């Protein structure tokens, strides 16, 4: 009965219990709810009204979550810059935003001034003592904690999340409550004790709101470092920590895992980037129980599928190369070049329809209309369904390797390679071929205790599984697979390195 209603009621149900725990500060539900009201009235006092854009620049402090909710409670449009983003990318976003306020962490006051010289914004605000603008925690300090009722259009965008090259995904309460609803399906009923070490600016902050909504406790960390995270799980008695798949491996392999206490976890949901099945298998063996839950989502589509914990260890199937089944209410069609629905089993673009679809891309109505067509999000992912409804991603459309007019799917070839015991990690990419236009390059990282990889054994296994053309013409053993700023392997830089 309204997205912020859901958040607030969650905080009212957790009034006396912890709600926001960072390493610096701890609020109850009642304390948390009080800061939100006072922050919201403070922002209102500064002139912000429904529809006004509030760009922010902060880490994952407590103050960041109160800010996100308070801005949205007013009905304003929260637009959170990740810290990780290059400063130029931030400016371009801040400029694109019809920004009515800019709210920054003191710690980051340098960057604030570079961006604000570059985009003069009114209502510069600081989350504590700071060189620039007024101090918002002070302003809230002197404000009443009287509840502020959400009264804006549930359908109008209250959040914008940035995705690089470089786009803001707008979200309204409507689609956010549906995202909330899906989270309860994935993560189970609340209350959760949820370890968020993802930016509050974007996905970490929605996950914060979901946790609170379901009446739970957000445990904030700035980022993922496996040793801190293992300590935090036991100390803060976490029920969930959302991981990039690499992070999952870092936990499961970390020497201090043996001394850590993980008994509090119900789940370790993971997603955001392609997993290595064999590695998820090892993580599963090393953790000792079905904790892992595979989540497939996008900022545009919200949650699309999840592979449950039980399906990770289902006796009669191997499903670790699946991102699982549709969430209740999510329809999935697999479509060809022209938008024809393909029969179950065939490869095509994953197109999803649900009430979780974004409101659309910020100030990009053309691109919106190319991406969402007749209420169907075209994901740019390629995959197939199976007769039990599991989704298998084989490639991003942009990564497909065209050899002699046949389609080689890079992600699908990696899984074959990584499935090999001698291979730990792999990246497949297309490079120029005189004869076949594009040939298949695979870089493979050897497992521990593997010496010389038999590159012919590996080509055979791909031929034998996918067929001849899927065979890597070029097969480098490497130390390391380069990575992009945002959890994802750097395919450009392998294309780039392979020429020279
Ligand atoms: N569990 C999973 N397994 C494989 N690919 C996944 C995945 N979850 C997400 N993806 C991939 O990553 C996409 C999700 O990206 P978005 O949420 O839109 C931006 P992002 O990956 O966070 O990058 P950004 O740094 O530009 O924000 C999907 O459309 C799909 O290609």
Residue numbers in the entry: 1 to 165, 170 to 504
Paper text:
As crystals of wild-type ShABS were initially not forthcoming, two mutants, K492A and K492H, of a lysine residue K492 implicated in interacting with ATP were prepared and subjected to crystallization trials, in an attempt to obtain a structure. Although no crystals were obtained in the presence of ATP or AMP and acid substrate, the inclusion of the noncleavable ATP analogue α,β-methylene adenosine 5′-triphosphate (AMP-CPP) was successful in giving diffracting crystals of ShABS K492H in the P21 space group, from which were obtained data sets that were refined to 2.01 (Data set #1) and 2.57 Ångstrom (Data set #2) resolution, the second of which contained density for AMP-CPP in the active site. This structure of ShABS (ShABSAdFigure 1a) featured two molecules in the asymmetric unit cell, each of which corresponded to the “adenylation” conformation of McbA, with an rmsd between the two enzymes of 1.50 Å over 469 C-α atoms. In the structure of ShABSAd obtained from Data set #1, following the building of the protein and water atoms, residual density in the omit maps was clearly visible, and this could be successfully modeled and refined as α,β-methylene adenosine 5′-triphosphate (AMP-CPP). Superimposition of ShABSAd and McbAAd permitted the positioning of the acid substrate 5 within the active site and a consequent analysis of probable active site interactions. The major differences in active site residues between the ShABSAd and McbAAd acid binding sites were W307 (ShABS) for F301 (McbA), W214 for C209, R175 for H170, C299 for N293, and S302 for T296. The presence of the two tryptophan residues is most likely to account for the differences in acid specificity between McbA and ShABS.
Amide Bond Synthetases (ABSs) actively catalyze both the ATP-dependent adenylation of carboxylic acid substrates and their subsequent amidation using an amine nucleophile, both within the active site of the enzyme, enabling the use of only a small excess of the amine partner. In this report, we describe the activity and specificity of an ABS from Streptoalloteichus hindustanus (ShABS), with a broader, complementary substrate spectrum to that of McbA that includes enantioselective behavior toward an expanded range of acid and amine partners in amidation reactions. The requirement for large excesses of amine in these reactions has prompted investigations into the ATP-dependent amide bond synthetase (ABS) class of enzymes, also members of the larger ANL (acyl-CoA synthetase–non-ribosomal peptide synthase–luciferase) family of adenylase enzymes, as these catalyze both the formation of the adenylate and the amidation reaction within one active site of the enzyme and require only one or low equivalents of the amine as a coupling partner. In common with other adenylases, McbA features a larger N-terminal domain coupled to a C-terminal “cap” domain.
